[model samples]
Target chain A: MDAVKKAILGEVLEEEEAYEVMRALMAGEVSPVRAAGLLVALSLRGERPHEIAAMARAMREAARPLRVHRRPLLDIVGTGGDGKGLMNLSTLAALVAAAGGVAVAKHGNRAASSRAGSADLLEALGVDLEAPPERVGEAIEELGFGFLFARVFHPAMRHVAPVRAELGVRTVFNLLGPLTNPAGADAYVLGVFSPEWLAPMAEALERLGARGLVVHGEGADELVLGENRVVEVGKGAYALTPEEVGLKRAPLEALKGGGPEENAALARRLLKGEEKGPLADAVALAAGAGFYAAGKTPSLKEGVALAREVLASGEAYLLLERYVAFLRA
Target chain B: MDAVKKAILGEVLEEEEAYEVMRALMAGEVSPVRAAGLLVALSLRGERPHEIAAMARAMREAARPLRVHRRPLLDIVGTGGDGKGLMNLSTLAALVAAAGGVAVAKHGNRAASSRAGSADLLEALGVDLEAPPERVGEAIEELGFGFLFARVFHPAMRHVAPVRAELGVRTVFNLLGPLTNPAGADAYVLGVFSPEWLAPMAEALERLGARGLVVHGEGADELVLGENRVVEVGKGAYALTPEEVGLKRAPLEALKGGGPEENAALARRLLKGEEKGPLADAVALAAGAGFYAAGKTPSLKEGVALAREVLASGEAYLLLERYVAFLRA
Candidate 1:
């Protein structure tokens, strides 16, 4: 135990012993400082998959479960630190997908890296952010869209929040949070801030027992879509580009949003079929990605068509209003 | 400052701001925990010479001084934690050098990483281990050998002492303590435990402005001479091994020492010029190395011959007796 503490405090923890420490932390057997120290040390050492698996396993046991109906569930999330001031594309896409009849359990949080996170945008939309596990499960069963606040779902993350805020820097834990969807959503659309992580992120999800599309989009405004967005798909890691999916790459400046309100306005406009810009295109592209992740469409183009049809018929907007009303009720 | 703390905590200390934190700690304005955390973080991040130099500079400022008259005083020391039960070969060698008219200011501690440390051996030899700086300095001036107890010299170390003891494991600080000798000994004969550190230890000394030989020895007994022995000589930033110095390899068993009593008895035997076993041979080799470091001998053989003459003529024993008597008086 002393050796474990020493290792967490920045001495080397041998690879073999790291699992034991992770297990202890998961079981709530280690102190907060020790757990935080171990997390930071492992991050600094560059986490191995087995270590990541062990830590994730522990985190899952400690977290408040997000119960969902035994139906297939999907979460549209990005690793979210591209510094890409783009609006909540995945969140909007999730809403649209739910309109198209797939059960959506969107797990999200406040903005930590970007200008606005999915939950931040959702908050602006006046959605109830503090849905309990049973309420979230009900939301999925009743309305096909469930919003699970990550902080509420994973209480232990609060222990690390102060340190992360104090340090004001992103760590490996930042990435781990999104990867740990409490509802056990079997399908996902995960966006990465960096292109290098496309394959690794997909592989990690596979290791965690899920099917997902991991995308790394390049954009202007620190994260606008000028360059081709990288993507990986399937249970086995596979690679693709926006062009491979027949989506044209536009200038990054074309997709920039003013703020959360502007992002929400854009979402309102897109759902009403009035907006025609890169924001719409990005929403469409992300929606297409989501459809493929949910196994509703074999190709991204087919997913994009399904997304456009839902918006053009005003079904997505009606679905959002109904879901919002149901939460209020 | 937060970034520095994060880095020191082995969390992400943004690369851009890391140097600033290091600079502040080196300047002695920060707490030891902050300093230690930063140092340990840098060590874990794969320490570079410049970073080590920066840290050693910060630590040297935080330490109390040992004002010596010599331009290049020799410190025969070890980084310990060889986990080898070896007798205190470096202490014996320091005594032999002191006997040979060289100024030896040996900085050491009680047993850590071993059953007995150099200070432990010196205490058993009737040397006062807790003399103040002035008494220690005066003894060096009169007898040519001074043993500076680490805790007495570095009060800052006191804060870290409990952490180190409680952790009960070797840390980066354990290695740093010997390198940042408060006396600022310009020449050193350092015995590191592993072969991998031969170059690093030598480079570290050179960066600290010391002309030194970093010895990585393997003696047969798992006590002193367990296997092969290697030495690194600092000729600027680079370290050269024994082979580079035109010295042939000797079997590790050739440098073995028995228990503390036997080791102490062997020191007496070597001073009396009666015993010629591995312990004596090892001392002759180390003493020879020290002489070369002091610039009094061009080669180890010349230094070994000088050490032999000093021992046979009783000059070395007289120096030892003077040191003990001065401390007693």
Candidate 2:
């Protein structure tokens, strides 16, 4: 707390010190006001990649663990708030990849600044948000994928929720959600909102022992629209043009979603092979990225072919049905 | 509050924006978290002299004012924390200067890392800490001096008290206490413990419409030993040599006090002409500075002579007696 206060005064803390303060905050040993001071101060200075990584680790340690079986599971999620309000591409991508035998544990929250957030998309598709962690863990073991609501996985978020809400601006907490998978997934595909966070997030994830890719689609925090930016942990950073990943060129509006019911209907059609076009291309591309991240396929081109096969063969639709039934149980 | 939070993030605010934030804090409109964050951040960036002045002005405006007749009043106060454990020299000086017809309104607080602070000394002398502001005002109006306890004058400090206590280190609030005299005492002799604060404190006071000397006397917060660093403010910062001011060289040890009772007894002897040596010289020097600050003498040398005369003639002691009687009333 003292180090954090010093940071507020203008002195940045070392990574380990910031981690200690964060652990104390999440453990309820630090005051809420002190927590606020640190967050605001860190924001003013711009959070260092190392501090963010340390805080994420502290947050994970403080969270309730789901502890599912290790399966080289991939997490497909995003650092939200693109303002382009794209449909939840990462969630759909996770489901497609999962149907194609790329194990997945998708982490998400309900919509805050955009329509059809990943959690909202799942709930709209009849997934139970209140299911216990054990039940959610079971769904992943049985169905190759499961939805881990951020609130359930990161219970320590209770200390930070009101602070983030009160700030009404992006904070480190918002950036950490996708970085901390309850399943302890070894592979990851994260779509960040801004290009600046690409390398830092990828570098930090690598440091945290994950092999992954961080993507920033031109106009949204999802694998849709124009050329996308990517940071592959071990291979280094580069741009991924839509065509290279088998996605047809489309404006951001082509990916935008309406409210829950409309988005749910569209998602059902896309997953059931009932819809085709730019949206399907985007969904297939996102799944390809996830498959590559999970090391299920050697490259995005091969992953996209598998994603197309899953959707056309109704395998993605079957996975969704199983998840929906599991949630009902 | 939002701007302050933004400030913690590293955005330096415009002077007016800083003033508005301070005003909101002093007026109890900002939350404690915001107040803490702003103070801590500003301290870290080093509170600019202009911001300090503006914040002091805002603080004075927020405080419950006594509005006593603004005579050529002297606030013999310190940005204390000398580590020398000095007795309350400025408070006693204010008393002696008032005896020599220098109107005084000494603003002070109880012990904070000090053996005997001004309010503590006054309490030992049996001055009422709970006197009504009107009664305290009457003391200045009728007796030419009054003890304005900080707690009484700056009721708004209640909003910030816990913050300071919890932080347990020097903050901007510690610096602001001497800057905001509730009685609007413009003529001043401010003893800053930190040498670095010398120019900034003086510059801030000058901008706040004050004419006075800011001193850092060797290791003490008040006039005691060796060459004293001073900012005649309008005349610019410079050193006040003991030879120039006709002060005898005395170590900071000459100013040490055991506690409130010991300080009160020593003060009584000095005021009554019963004590002589380095302690007596230091007391007369501070009182002389106050006399000069109150515009009672053309120069510090002349002020020193007058202070010696008043102490020898027992007038300073008589004034203390009168103040004691008034407080009892």
Task: For each candidate, report its DockQ versus the true two-chain complex.
Answer: 0.11, 0.37
Over the stretch A109-153, how does candidate 2's per-residue lDDT look in tens digits? 888744777788888899889999999889888888898898777
Provide the TM-score of chain A alone for each candidate, in the order shown: 0.85, 0.95
Q: Judge candidate 1 against the unseen true structure and give its global Cα lDDT, from 0 to 1.
A: 0.66
Candidate 2 chain A weakest lDDT stretch, 10 residues? A1-10
What's the lDDT for residue A82 in model 2? 68
**Top DockQ model:** 2
State TM-scores per candidate. Answer: 0.74, 0.87
Chain A, candidate 1, TM-score of 0.85
Model 2, residue pairs in steric clash = A9-B44, A44-B9, A44-B10
Point out the worst 10-residue segment of candidate 1 chain A by lDDT.
A219-228
Against the true structure, whose TM-score is highest?
Answer: 2
